[PDB]
Design a protein around this ligand. Structure first.
Ligand code: SF4
Lengths: 67, 241
């Protein structure tokens, strides 16, 4: 039965039936990341904000004098 | 088309009347046994195997003959003398069926030493059968011989019961494929399993008569069959590649 299906001419035994399935390639698939993979200094942020605000204050004073 | 036992022919036979069926040879010797004495008849043979027997010797025998001889005589003595020995010499012998066609055959090892007796061939997993000698030499295809015997049995089966009727052709085709080598190793065990299936499961013993020769063939020459099976690959697998 299965000899008529998978067998080949001159097949000597049933143990010689080849099997071709969806199989992993030799050596297995490469590794994959699994776990979770993950800023600015608050002092620097505050310094920049303070500098910008102070420039705005200086502009405000200058424009107030002009007005 | 045979009946089943029970009932027996003596209890119910022809036309429902008591009847005993006998062989020609058994009937013929009776007046001589009666005239010459059961004591004289018992003077020959071993225990429970007394008397003489007519022997038909055929095959590859220098002098084939139908001769009368004392029971329990060795095959080698019975064949070398009164039959001229094996064609090509005793060493050219391959196998011999000592009891016709329904009994298992014997190789050269078993044959050399065993006697022609009911209680000697039986223990050799064979049978005296009809005490008919068939002789095969080394140039003979034993597989072809057994296949032809199976074909004969297939043509001779009456087909009344299922197992024999349906398995004679199966056995013949198995043997025919074996002859060309178009078979596999496990299919030999499959054949033996089928022989076990038929044996002792039918209405009459003709199933046993067909199953037995292949059984002994396998048991004594499985090397030849496997060699043939592999050898077909040298003439069938060359085109498969
Ligand atoms: S064994 Fe075969 S020949 Fe004998 S009765 Fe059954 S079918 Fe007929």
């Amino acid at each position: 039965t299965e000899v008529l299906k998978r067998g080949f001419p001159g097949m000597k035994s049933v143990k010689d039936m080849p099997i071709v399935q969806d199989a992993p390639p030799p050596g297995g698939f490469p590794t994959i990341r699994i776990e979770r993979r993950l800023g600015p200094t608050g002092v620097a942020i505050f310094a920049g904000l303070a500098a910008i605000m102070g420039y705005g204050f200086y502009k405000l004073h200058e424009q107030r004098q002009e007005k | 088309k045979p009946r089943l036992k029970p009932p027996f022919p003596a209890g119910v036979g022809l036309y429902g009347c008591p009847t005993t069926v006998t062989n020609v040879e058994t009937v013929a010797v009776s007046p001589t046994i009666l005239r010459r004495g059961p004591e004289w008849f018992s003077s020959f043979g071993r225990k429970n195997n007394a008397g003489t027997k007519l022997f038909c010797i055929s095959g590859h025998v220098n002098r084939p003959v139908t001769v009368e001889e004392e029971m329990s005589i060795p095959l080698k003595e019975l064949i070398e003398r009164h039959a001229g020995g094996v064609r090509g010499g005793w060493d050219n012998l391959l196998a011999i069926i000592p009891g016709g066609s329904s009994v298992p055959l014997l190789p050269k090892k078993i044959c050399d030493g065993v006697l022609m007796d009911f209680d000697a061939l039986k223990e050799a997993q064979s049978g005296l059968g009809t005490a008919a000698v068939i002789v095969m030499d080394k140039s003979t295809d034993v597989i072809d011989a057994i296949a032809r015997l199976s074909y004969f049995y297939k043509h001779e089966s009456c087909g009344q019961c299922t197992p024999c009727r349906e398995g004679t052709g199966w056995l013949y085709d198995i043997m025919t494929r074996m002859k060309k080598g178009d078979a596999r190793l496990e299919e030999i065990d499959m054949l033996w399993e089928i022989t076990k299936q038929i044996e002792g499961h039918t209405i009459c013993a003709l199933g046993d008569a067909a199953a037995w020769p292949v059984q002994g063939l396998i048991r004594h020459f499985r090397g030849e069959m496997e060699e043939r099976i592999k050898s077909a690959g040298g003439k069938k697998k060359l085109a498969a590649t």
